[PDB]
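Materials and Methods. Structural model of phycobilin synthase. The 209-residue sequence of phycobilin synthase from Prochlorococcus phage p-ssm2 was retrieved and submitted for structure prediction as follows.
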Amino acid sequence: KTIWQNYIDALFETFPQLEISEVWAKWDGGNVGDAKLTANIRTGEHFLKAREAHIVDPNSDIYNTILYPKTGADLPCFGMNLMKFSDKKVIIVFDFQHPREKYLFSVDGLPEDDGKYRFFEMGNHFSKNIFVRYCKPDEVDQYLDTFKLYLTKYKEMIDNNKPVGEDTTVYSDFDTYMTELDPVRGYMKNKFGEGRSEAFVNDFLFSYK
Ligand SMILES: C=CC1=C(C)/C(=C/c2[nH]c(/C=C3N=C(/C=C4\NC(=O)C(C)=C4C=C)C(C)=C\3CCC(=O)O)c(CCC(=O)O)c2C)NC1=O
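The predicted structure was written out as tokens:
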């Protein structure tokens, strides 16, 4: 079981076409294992891919998923990182992540946040509407309706533009940026080893570099 289940359900209710097209990894690790990784690639109409990583151990529950739309409509990706770190500490992040470097994207009517957060440069693959909240595991679903508004706006963008391009190099700047700045490598090395951490980051999470 996972505390992120209602986010995950909402995601695939909005985009029921996103079917698993490859289980990229199911790995065991952590203490003898207590940490499990599931890494799925999904495909479906209007998307290049959605890649979904879910890492669960006794204290942590991390759901990191990015939807990469087909190209040709200048659409942002939709990214979420739902991170339970301990039984006291959760960070919820989701946003429209635009592939063009240093382009400030926004959707009018959505919550706005111009604060600066760790690791990342705001305005550069994160939008005016980046949604970041810190709360306790049992509070996570209080932002679910907002997550669902983001999904609703995203689905309108997809359905109104109907992108059909498949130029994965549109996402190369984005994947490069997400690679240098995301704090993953360290956590996965410790839990799973070096080769697995490297491949997870470079060949699964951000593979369009
Ligand atoms: C898979 C394993 C995995 C690990 C181990 C991980 C760790 C991780 N991500 C973080 C932050 C963050 N991560 C993001 C955002 C994202 N990052 C993304 O990969 C995507 C897709 C988004 C958003 C759509 C942001 C904005 C922060 C900073 C949060 C903050 O400022 O505290 C932090 C810092 C938390 C803190 O400030 O205390 C850690 C430790 N992220 C992972 O994905």
